[PDB]
Ligand binder design. Structure first.
Ligand SMILES: C=C[C@]1(C)C[C@@H](OC(=O)CS[C@H]2C[C@H]3CC[C@@H](C2)N3C)[C@]2(C)[C@H](C)CC[C@]3(CCC(=O)[C@H]32)[C@@H](C)[C@@H]1O
Ligand SMILES: [K+]
Ligand SMILES: [K+]
Ligand SMILES: [K+]
Ligand SMILES: [K+]
Ligand SMILES: [K+]
Ligand SMILES: [K+]
Ligand SMILES: [K+]
Ligand SMILES: [K+]
Ligand SMILES: [K+]
Ligand SMILES: [K+]
Ligand SMILES: [K+]
Ligand SMILES: [K+]
Ligand SMILES: [K+]
Ligand SMILES: [K+]
Ligand SMILES: [K+]
Ligand SMILES: [K+]
Ligand SMILES: [K+]
Ligand SMILES: [K+]
Ligand SMILES: [K+]
Ligand SMILES: [K+]
Ligand SMILES: [Mg+2]
Ligand SMILES: [Mg+2]
Ligand SMILES: [Mg+2]
Ligand SMILES: [Mg+2]
Ligand SMILES: [Mg+2]
Ligand SMILES: [Mg+2]
Ligand SMILES: [Mg+2]
Ligand SMILES: [Mg+2]
Ligand SMILES: [Mg+2]
Ligand SMILES: [Mg+2]
Ligand SMILES: [Mg+2]
Ligand SMILES: [Mg+2]
Ligand SMILES: [Mg+2]
Ligand SMILES: [Mg+2]
Ligand SMILES: [Mg+2]
Ligand SMILES: [Mg+2]
Ligand SMILES: [Mg+2]
Ligand SMILES: [Mg+2]
Ligand SMILES: [Mg+2]
Ligand SMILES: [Mg+2]
Ligand SMILES: [Mg+2]
Ligand SMILES: [Mg+2]
Ligand SMILES: [Mg+2]
Ligand SMILES: [Mg+2]
Ligand SMILES: [Mg+2]
Ligand SMILES: [Mg+2]
Ligand SMILES: [Mg+2]
Ligand SMILES: [Mg+2]
Ligand SMILES: [Mg+2]
Ligand SMILES: [Mg+2]
Ligand SMILES: [Mg+2]
Ligand SMILES: [Mg+2]
Ligand SMILES: [Mg+2]
Ligand SMILES: [Mg+2]
Ligand SMILES: [Mg+2]
Ligand SMILES: [Mg+2]
Ligand SMILES: [Mg+2]
Ligand SMILES: [Mg+2]
Ligand SMILES: [Mg+2]
Ligand SMILES: [Mg+2]
Ligand SMILES: [Mg+2]
Ligand SMILES: [Mg+2]
Ligand SMILES: [Mg+2]
Ligand SMILES: [Mg+2]
Ligand SMILES: [Mg+2]
Ligand SMILES: [Mg+2]
Ligand SMILES: [Mg+2]
Ligand SMILES: [Mg+2]
Lengths: 93, 136, 77
RNA sequence: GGUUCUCCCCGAAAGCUAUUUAGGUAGCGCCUCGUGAAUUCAUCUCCGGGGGUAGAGCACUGUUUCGGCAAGGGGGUCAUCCCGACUUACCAACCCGAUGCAAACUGCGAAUACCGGAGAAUGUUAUCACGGGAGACACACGGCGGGUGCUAACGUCCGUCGUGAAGAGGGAAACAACCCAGACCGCCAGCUAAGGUCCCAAAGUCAUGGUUAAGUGGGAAACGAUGUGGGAAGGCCCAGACAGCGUCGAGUCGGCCUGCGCGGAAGAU
RNA sequence: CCUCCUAAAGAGUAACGGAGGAGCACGAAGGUUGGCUAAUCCUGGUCGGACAUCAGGAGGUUAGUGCAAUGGCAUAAGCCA
RNA sequence: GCUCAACGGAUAAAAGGUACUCCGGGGAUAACAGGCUGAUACCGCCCAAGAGUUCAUAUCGACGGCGGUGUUUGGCACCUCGAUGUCGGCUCAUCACAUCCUGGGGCUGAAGUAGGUCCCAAGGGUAUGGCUGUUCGCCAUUUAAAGUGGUACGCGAGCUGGGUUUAGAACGUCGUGAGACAGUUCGGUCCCUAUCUGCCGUGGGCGCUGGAGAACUGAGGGGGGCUGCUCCUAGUACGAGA
RNA sequence: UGCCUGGCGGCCGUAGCGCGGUGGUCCCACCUGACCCCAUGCCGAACUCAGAAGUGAAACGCCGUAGCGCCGAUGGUAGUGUGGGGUCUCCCCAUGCGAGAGUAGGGAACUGCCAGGCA
């Protein structure tokens, strides 16, 4: 799986709700000894691929800033009732 | 129908029912019936819905009830005035928030789970949705 | 008809009277409490009803201290 | 119940406490007048504080479901002097792992608020004390947090803010309490607020892009439905799909999310 | 009159709101000095059993507090002299 | 030295009745009606366990769910206590439609006849008596049918006054008693000459463009709109017959 | 100046448990006896005293080791002050504040004074 992503400019509740009100959602890449990277993801693209059970098991590549970050899906915050993703934690493999 | 075997106190403040649910994942079975709406589920409603889905599966698979009606609801008798103390406990409710998985089911096909939960949902005062166990 | 409740005691006006950094005269009550929610530190006495009071003129200082992480009140004189 | 001329300045309360008190009254709170005194007070920023609410959580107090483990305990043969041994539609504590719930749960814990300190700016001293004079102690609605009630009431009882009360003007058809806004007087000047700009009726029959066909707009839910718009993704398809009768030559199928509509929808001049 | 909750994390805060208590006790159950540490369960043990006392261990206040509840309490405010 | 416990403690020292009543007040506060509300009530609807030989959905609808009405029982105490006359009847109504009859129609577990159920429909129509103050109800006998509600539970400045609710009296019952009972019993004053609105009738004035006498047109308004039975069609269709 | 031990503090779990080592010269511990001082609601167990043959067994200290306890970001979520809005039992928007839980990860404390042993 290859996910395209942008570095989030703005963080916090207001920024994050604005992302999701435009069919994106925040995510975080952390782990290793590099600083956490806060990213924004296209919602429908990721929701489609996380339907597959392979998404959560296999290593994924986040193309953020044109750079390939290999990651595993660590945690997902789902929307309480709707079939949507609020947030994903990625750990640098 | 479900009711606490004991409680510390007989009567409970009305309270409010704000927020989203805890227990939003199918944690036990394969399939779940999730609350989309907010409200009260009475013990009678929980039972009615349980009997519906149970009869649909023809006593096959396994059913979990994730919600428990632990909130006593009082009522005043007819033709009594206001005040003179809090009314008597008449029934028990579970407070439901959006996202609350109400029932779960395992050991049936999805098709039959969807039908069983559709029959159960018609007994409930809250809008529900079918959900499946997620890998994460 | 009737109810068996309808009783309550007078509110006791407990709690902190002088907060951190407040300048007090000796004798000033810092906290009224039931038991030692706060403990007497330096230049603070503990009365018979667990009232903490200043034994010196100075500034109230709250501190967490010791192996149980208990709250002490002191006066920095 | 009624209380008679005029103008100017300020301007409440409908609370607490007590009361043979509850529509009365007293002290205090709030008003006024006077006198006197500190950057005295307020806002903001920064600093020092305590907190156990919201939220959360489940170690505790309780409650709760599932699974595992199983001390024991019923239900019953074979045995039966004393015993034992298999055995359960079985009912099962503790402990372990999962899941929730709590005003009177808390191994967590905000925002705010409050207390104190410091510093500017600003404010008719806005502060405190003392003294002369009161009035008031039926509140109402609205917002927010709650108890009660049916998260019924233009209900009731608290907290807190706003307005009415004691406040005109503009808006909400009309409409104390909502929205805008605080009327010293005069003007046949101008700009705006809320709210509006087709006619009644002041101002766009304004511009651009969409949606709706229900007069929806301009009352009503579960639920029902090839209404219609948008988005993402599939199944099958010129190795001929889908429908109709191998033929037939182009798409077809029904879930998902979403916008706006439709039915559901019966009342008395 | 007391305690808790309602009570909106300072104080205070209503209802014929939700729950309980008081109208005492004690010359020690007060003072001080010195000392001490609980429940509960497991294993073993005359009578003795589910539970008496004894011994060891687990446990760590889940006890205790003259009497409600809350807050306290090991330096104990608990227990003994 | 105080259960002065009604606990800021009127006195050292204190219970009741009033329908024989009275005054000052209050819509600050109840009874009626209105209002707000809609728990309850009534009426719809959703799901479909099941009943219905078989068959959920002809008919019915368990467990539960969602509404509508304002419509019962209530809640509240907003209007009225310097008075908003009350149950029932009589007289006269008027509207709604959730339709009782008559009209139209779908489904039927509708052969016919006759039903059941649902939809449309408010034009008109929609009992008399016995008992009881009754409304209601039961009963008798009609009817095509004897609708359900709203209208201050329509209507006392229209009538009645049997009921409720003054003063008299008695019974049962309670009370030592005065007296009392949403127990019973017998008796027991119902005022108003209509100003305004409204309504039914009926004139006067002026207008309508010179005046006058007639006949009209018809904007618009009102009235009316019910229905039985018999016979024929035909003992036909239908039916094993009945 | 290093290493070890004792005492007294700071600090109050990143510091506590468990589990595997390990130390006796000194120190510490157990230890050895008790007419004594003092002691046991009985008991030299403890407390106390007189001691130094023995052992680090226990304890204690030290070291190692994540199976726990503990600590713990980032991001998101919840809540919320102010202003505004909706379909107003509940939410949403702007702005400010922003948890709890969980995740990555951290983690087998660190440190002052004095005394003694050893090097
Ligand atoms: C006197 C008042 C009356 C005529 C009657 C009254 O009824 C009552 O008050 C019942 S008590 C009864 C009334 C009269 C006077 C004394 C005696 C007791 N009885 C003969 C009655 C039915 C209501 C209950 C209260 C309101 C009333 C207005 C409308 C109504 O229905 C009336 C009052 C305002 C009316 O004036
Ligand atoms: K003080
Ligand atoms: K006063
Ligand atoms: K004054
Ligand atoms: K308020
Ligand atoms: K004002
Ligand atoms: K319209
Ligand atoms: K003593
Ligand atoms: K009194
Ligand atoms: K008297
Ligand atoms: K309906
Ligand atoms: K059938
Ligand atoms: K009256
Ligand atoms: K009528
Ligand atoms: K029919
Ligand atoms: K009709
Ligand atoms: K009336
Ligand atoms: K009458
Ligand atoms: K009249
Ligand atoms: K008359
Ligand atoms: K008039
Ligand atoms: Mg925000
Ligand atoms: Mg209290
Ligand atoms: Mg401490
Ligand atoms: Mg003024
Ligand atoms: Mg008195
Ligand atoms: Mg909470
Ligand atoms: Mg008063
Ligand atoms: Mg008052
Ligand atoms: Mg008030
Ligand atoms: Mg409120
Ligand atoms: Mg009110
Ligand atoms: Mg209200
Ligand atoms: Mg007034
Ligand atoms: Mg005004
Ligand atoms: Mg106005
Ligand atoms: Mg106007
Ligand atoms: Mg202008
Ligand atoms: Mg105009
Ligand atoms: Mg135009
Ligand atoms: Mg409309
Ligand atoms: Mg609709
Ligand atoms: Mg408080
Ligand atoms: Mg507060
Ligand atoms: Mg107050
Ligand atoms: Mg003592
Ligand atoms: Mg008193
Ligand atoms: Mg009078
Ligand atoms: Mg009133
Ligand atoms: Mg009334
Ligand atoms: Mg009523
Ligand atoms: Mg009131
Ligand atoms: Mg009225
Ligand atoms: Mg009058
Ligand atoms: Mg109709
Ligand atoms: Mg008509
Ligand atoms: Mg006609
Ligand atoms: Mg009759
Ligand atoms: Mg009437
Ligand atoms: Mg009528
Ligand atoms: Mg008359
Ligand atoms: Mg009349
Ligand atoms: Mg009479
Ligand atoms: Mg008499
Ligand atoms: Mg007519
Ligand atoms: Mg010894
Ligand atoms: Mg050893
Ligand atoms: Mg955190
Ligand atoms: Mg260790």
């Amino acid at each position: 799986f290859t996910i395209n992503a942008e570095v989030r400019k703005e963080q916090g509740k207001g920024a994050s709700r604005r992302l999701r009100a435009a069919n994106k959602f925040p995510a975080i890449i952390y782990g290793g000894k590099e600083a956490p990277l806060a990213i924004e993801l296209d919602h429908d693209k990721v929701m489609n691929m996380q339907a597959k059970a392979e998404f959560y098991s296999e290593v994924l590549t986040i193309v953020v800033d044109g750079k390939e970050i290999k990651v595993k899906a660590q945690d997902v915050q789902r929307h309480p009732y709707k079939p949507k993703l609020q947030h994903i934690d990625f750990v640098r493999a | 129908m479900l009711q606490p075997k004991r409680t510390k106190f007989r009567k409970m403040h009305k309270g409010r029912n704000r927020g989203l649910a805890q227990g939003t994942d199918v944690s036990f079975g394969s399939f779940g019936l999730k609350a989309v709406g907010r409200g009260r589920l009475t013990a009678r409603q929980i039972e009615a819905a349980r009997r519906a889905m149970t009869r649909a599966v023809k006593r096959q698979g396994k059913i979990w009830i994730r919600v428990f009606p632990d909130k006593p609801i009082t009522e005043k008798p007819l033709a009594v005035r206001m005040g003179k103390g809090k009314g008597n406990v008449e029934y028990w409710v579970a407070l439901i928030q959006p996202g609350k998985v109400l029932y779960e089911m395992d050991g049936v096909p999805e098709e039959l789970a969807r039908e069983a939960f559709k029959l159960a949902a018609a007994k409930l005062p809250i809008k529900t949705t079918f959900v499946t166990k997620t890998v994460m | 008809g009737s109810t068996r409740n309808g009783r309550d005691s007078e509110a006791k006006r407990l709690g902190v009277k002088r907060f951190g950094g407040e300048s007090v005269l000796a004798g000033s009550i810092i906290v009224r409490q039931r038991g030692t929610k706060f403990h007497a530190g330096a230049n603070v006495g503990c009365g018979r009803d667990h009232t903490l009071f200043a034994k010196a003129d100075g500034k109230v200082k709250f501190e967490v201290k010791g192996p149980k992480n208990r709250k002490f009140i002191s006066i920095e004189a």
